[PDB]
Amino acid sequence: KWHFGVRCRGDAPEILLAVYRALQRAGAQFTVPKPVNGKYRSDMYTIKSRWEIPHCKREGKNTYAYIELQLYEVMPGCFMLDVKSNGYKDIYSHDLKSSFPFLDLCAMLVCKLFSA
Amino acid sequence: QYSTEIPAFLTSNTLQELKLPKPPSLPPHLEKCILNSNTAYKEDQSVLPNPNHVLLNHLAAANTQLGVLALSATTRYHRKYVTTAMFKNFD
Amino acid sequence: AMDVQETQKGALKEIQAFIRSRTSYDVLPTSFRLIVFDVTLFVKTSLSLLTLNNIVSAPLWDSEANKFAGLLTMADFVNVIKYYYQSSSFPEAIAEIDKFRLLGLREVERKIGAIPPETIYVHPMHSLMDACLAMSKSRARRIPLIDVDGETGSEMIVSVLTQYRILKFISMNCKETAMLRVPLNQMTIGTWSNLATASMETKVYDVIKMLAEKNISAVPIVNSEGTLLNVYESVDVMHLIQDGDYSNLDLSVGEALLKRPANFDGVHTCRATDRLDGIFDAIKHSRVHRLFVVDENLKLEGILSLADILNYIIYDKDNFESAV
Numbered sequence: 001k002w003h004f005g006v007r008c009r010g011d012a013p014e015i016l017l018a019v020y021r022a023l024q025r026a027g028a029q030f031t032v033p034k035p036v037n038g039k040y041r042s043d044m045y046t047i048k049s050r051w052e053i054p055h056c057k058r059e060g061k062n063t064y065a066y067i068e069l070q071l072y073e074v075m076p077g078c079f080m081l082d083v084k085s086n087g088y089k090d091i092y093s094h095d096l097k098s099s100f101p102f103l104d105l106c107a108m109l110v111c112k113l114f115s116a
Numbered sequence: 117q118y119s120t121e122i123p124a125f126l127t128s129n130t131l132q133e134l135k136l137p138k139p140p141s142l143p144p145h146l147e148k149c150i151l152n153s154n155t156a157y158k159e160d161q162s163v164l165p166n167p168n169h170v171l172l173n174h175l176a177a178a179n180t181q182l183g184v185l186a187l188s189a190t191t192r193y194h195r196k197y198v199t200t201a202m203f204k205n206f207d
Numbered sequence: 208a209m210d211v212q213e214t215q216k217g218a219l220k221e222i223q224a225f226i227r228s229r230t231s232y233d234v235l236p237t238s239f240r241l242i243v244f245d246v247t248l249f250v251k252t253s254l255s256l257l258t259l260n261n262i263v264s265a266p267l268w269d270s271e272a273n274k275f276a277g278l279l280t281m282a283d284f285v286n287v288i289k290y291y292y293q294s295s296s297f298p299e300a301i302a303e304i305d306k307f308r309l310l311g312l313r314e315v316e317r318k319i320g321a322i323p324p325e326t327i328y329v330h331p332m333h334s335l336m337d338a339c340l341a342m343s344k345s346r347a348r349r350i351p352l353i354d355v356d357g358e359t360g361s362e363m364i365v366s367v368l369t370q371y372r373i374l375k376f377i378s379m380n381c382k383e384t385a386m387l388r389v390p391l392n393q394m395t396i397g398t399w400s401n402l403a404t405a406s407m408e409t410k411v412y413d414v415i416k417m418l419a420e421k422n423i424s425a426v427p428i429v430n431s432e433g434t435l436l437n438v439y440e441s442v443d444v445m446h447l448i449q450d451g452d453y454s455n456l457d458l459s460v461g462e463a464l465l466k467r468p469a470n471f472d473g474v475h476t477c478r479a480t481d482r483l484d485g486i487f488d489a490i491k492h493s494r495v496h497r498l499f500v501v502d503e504n505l506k507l508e509g510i511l512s513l514a515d516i517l518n519y520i521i522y523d524k525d526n527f528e529s530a531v
């Protein structure tokens with residue numbers, strides 16, 4: 001029953017679109033493809049996002065969460081959208097890796113992918 | 117370099133179209149999730165095997181039939197591993 | 208130092224020293240699962256999730272703040288039921304529970320007196336002694352290990368430590384358990400009078416009132432002659448209410464004990480002449496939650512509980528039930 005990421009079906013860039021819009025609805029910010037003169041490079045399905053962490057926003061602390069997404073073709077027509085955590089960093093100083101708020105954010109994202 | 121706006125070309129739209137690249141195929145290690153392992157209720161049902169330090173912090177998901185979201189990630193706490201499994205509403 | 212009760216005396220000394228020198232971290236397996244619920248989950252859902260995952264408890268997450276939001280245990284249910292039975296002139300009022308989200312169950316409890324005001328837990332890198340003192344200061348039978356990620360201020364629920372898993376840890380790690388050779392009836396340990404007991408004829412809600420009133424986790428069932436037959440645990444209450452049938456509470460104990468899945472840690476017994484050395488061994492290899500002390504003919508004499516044992520080693524020589 002447990003599996004990495006979330007399943008997707010249909011058209012590869014159709015799914016890329018939905019993920020992008022879903023980020024936009026969460027208020028995450030994201031990298032974007034850049035072609036090779038032409039000409040879109042397969043790494044377009046590698047998205048680095050940055051998320052303002054709400055409970056820190058509530059204090060008014062500028063602490064961010066870094067989340068990388070990656071699409072993989074699984075069968076033809078089936079995809080895993082893989083989500084991984086690059087950690088959290090506040091704009092200040094001065095060494096735990098909690099799954100939170102990373103898991104609370106994947107929760108948000110998944111709500112956006114579905115309410116679409 | 118971050119950004120707030122939807123790339124334009126993903127609205128052209130959108131069949132036609134570039135005939136753009138595929139994403140890479142699924143690598144063999146995301147085929148298996150250690151949560152599917154309960155060798156351990158003999159007798160401590162919380163024990164998992166050691167994870168694989170590539171897959172620390174990758175979200176995994178699961179069907180509940182209960183109308184909530186099942187999420188989890190694995191992380192190192194000092195020198196031990198905690199896979200947390202979150203059950204959460206949608207609203 | 209060189210005879211029973213002087214050898215035990217010294218043996219206990221090493222065991223507490225062992226306890227202080229370890230951390231809660233140390234008790235944990237090197238790779239394990241932790242299940243966590245959102246505080247806003249509905250009560251029915253959370254009950255379905257305990258059973259389905261085969262657990263009796265779960266730490267709650269308050270996800271908007273990123274803060275630990277309490278510990279969910281069968282005690283929460285036992286306390287609300289007691290309250291309704293003692294206060295409501297309306298037997299079907301208990302059904303109301305199902306509408307609550309865990310957060311609103313916890314408010315009812317808060318309002319009702321059933322919960323401490325601030326919120327018991329320890330750092331996993333502090334001493335294991337810290338965990339015991341707390342679990343015995345409040346009579347909680349499990350405790351969250353909570354750390355804080357200083358990059359976010361968010362809390363990190365590392366694990367929940369039970370009394371059972373502390374004792375198992377001690378059983379597997381301390382050679383000196385084998386030197387506790389003093390029979391129970393010589394030491395001062397366990398309860399030996401005023402036992403809350405019940406029979407098959409007894410009604411479940413009466414058993415639940417006993418559990419809440421004496422802050423006990425279980426109640427022995429005896430026959431007319433007082434031979435030990437079985438037990439009714441606060442975890443047993445979970446199996447009656449799991450389908451929303453809050454009228455299963457009017458069942459006799461016997462009827463309700465038939466609805467029990469095999470699964471069941473069993474009932475453990477010792478004679479009064481038994482010593483702690485054998486019990487740590489029972490613990491080493493099996494899931495004991497308590498020992499009923501009985502005679503030749505299985506007649507109940509008293510109860511030796513996990514708190515009882517922990518308390519005996521860690522210390523130098525009507526209302527409400529705690530986290531279960």
Ligand SMILES: Nc1ncnc2c1ncn2[C@@H]1O[C@H](COP(=O)(O)OP(=O)(O)O)[C@@H](O)[C@H]1O
Nearest residue numbers: 160161162240241242262263264265369371372
């Ligand atoms: N919230 C939880 N998440 C994951 N596993 C749990 C949880 N609660 C209990 N368990 C597991 O269930 C099994 C039974 O434990 P439990 O009945 O809770 O107490 P004990 O530690 O006395 O066995 C143990 O293997 C324990 O690790």
Ligand SMILES: Nc1ncnc2c1ncn2[C@@H]1O[C@H](COP(=O)(O)OP(=O)(O)O)[C@@H](O)[C@H]1O
Nearest residue numbers: 397398401402403422423424425497510512514
């Ligand atoms: N049926 C009972 N009657 C009287 N005292 C009890 C009973 N069961 C346990 N106790 C005592 O009350 C305290 C509660 O211990 P606890 O760990 O809750 O018991 P258990 O978990 O075995 O039900 C302990 O001192 C224990 O010895």
